[PDB]
Amino acid sequence: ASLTEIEHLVQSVCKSYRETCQLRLEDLLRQRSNIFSREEVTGYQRKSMWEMWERCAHHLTEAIQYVVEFAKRLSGFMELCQNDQIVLLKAGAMEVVLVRMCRAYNADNRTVFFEGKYGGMELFRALGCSELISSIFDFSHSLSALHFSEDEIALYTALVLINAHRPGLQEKRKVEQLQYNLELAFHHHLCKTHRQSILAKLPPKGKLRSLCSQHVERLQIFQHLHP
């Protein structure tokens, strides 16, 4: 690539994220004062695990739909054979959703935006997997402390998805090329915005794999019996 072709890649990835970000950052920030009351929190905790599951499943499925639309607008993604488009999304979609969640999290009171208001992890008590929920909250708290910009999220999440080492890739070389060009873009933008410092602060890549694998294993247990 040439430097202006890289800048062009950046701009495009950043626009794709803006068009598929699902909740706009301005509206999340403005809602931080809109917090569940103790009686509303009690209402969630009284819900059966089954109802909580169904709600969580619906919001996850919505989120994944936006991630998929994002993938589709990354240049070169749609020219990949359908097998590899599926491999990459199967592996990385939930990982991207976990990263996107940091935008909806308030590290000042450890609350997340859920169904219209902010609430703590105790909102989710009826699922009975506090270990998992607290590690999700802990991961988002780790990310929020970086003060991730919109564009940083865009570029980082595209590299979450465009990863040549996922197994079953039928055109591993095409994916490498796209990953390479997105890495150049990412590192270039960090230089133009003076944010080189965040690279060494990003989650160990295995961190997201390992958290997503656990998260899916809970989802697995809920959406087998009773889809």
Side-chain angles (χ1 to χ4, degrees), residues 39-213:
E39 292 87 348
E40 295 185 300
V41 162
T42 299
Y44 277 106
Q45 294 172 336
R46 293 191 48 201
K47 292 178 194 299
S48 92
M49 68 185 62
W50 291 100
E51 196 200 334
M52 290 296 297
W53 155 249
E54 284 191 61
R55 292 176 176 238
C56 287
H58 170 268
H59 299 299
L60 287 171
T61 305
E62 183 158 18
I64 285 165
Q65 288 187 3
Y66 285 83
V67 173
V68 167
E69 295 296 325
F70 175 66
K72 289 176 100 189
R73 296 155 188 237
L74 295 177
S75 45
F77 188 82
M78 284 316 274
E79 285 67 47
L80 302 178
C81 62
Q82 302 272 107
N83 170 89
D84 286 12
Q85 293 185 31
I86 298 303
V87 160
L88 295 173
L89 280 162
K90 177 182 197 78
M94 201 57 87
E95 299 179 7
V96 171
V97 176
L98 287 146
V99 175
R100 289 179 160 211
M101 181 188 321
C102 74
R103 289 168 80 251
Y105 176 86
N106 187 358
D108 280 295
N109 62 12
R110 298 185 135 289
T111 59
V112 73
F113 197 58
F114 182 77
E115 303 190 326
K117 297 200 195 180
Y118 280 79
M121 60 180 257
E122 73 285 14
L123 205 75
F124 300 97
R125 202 169 67 189
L127 294 171
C129 57
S130 62
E131 290 76 10
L132 172 71
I133 304 313
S134 92
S135 94
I136 290 174
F137 273 57
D138 269 41
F139 179 73
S140 294
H141 207 247
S142 277
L143 277 182
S144 291
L146 302 169
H147 302 282
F148 245 16
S149 76
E150 292 294 78
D151 287 347
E152 282 161 9
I153 283 177
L155 291 155
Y156 182 66
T157 58
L159 286 159
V160 167
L161 284 182
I162 311 297
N163 172 359
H165 301 105
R166 305 302 198 179
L169 289 174
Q170 296 180 356
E171 282 140 31
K172 184 180 169 172
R173 177 54 184 206
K174 274 56 176 182
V175 180
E176 281 178 350
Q177 192 60 93
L178 298 184
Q179 179 184 345
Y180 175 87
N181 287 334
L182 288 163
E183 297 171 333
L184 269 58
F186 183 42
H187 298 154
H188 182 63
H189 199 58
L190 295 176
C191 294
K192 303 287 282 192
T193 55
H194 313 285
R195 298 291 299 283
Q196 303 93 324
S197 71
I198 65 111
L199 284 169
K201 305 182 175 176
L202 308 168
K205 220 167 85 161
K207 188 161 189 134
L208 191 65
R209 286 325 141 287
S210 61
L211 185 57
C212 201
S213 308

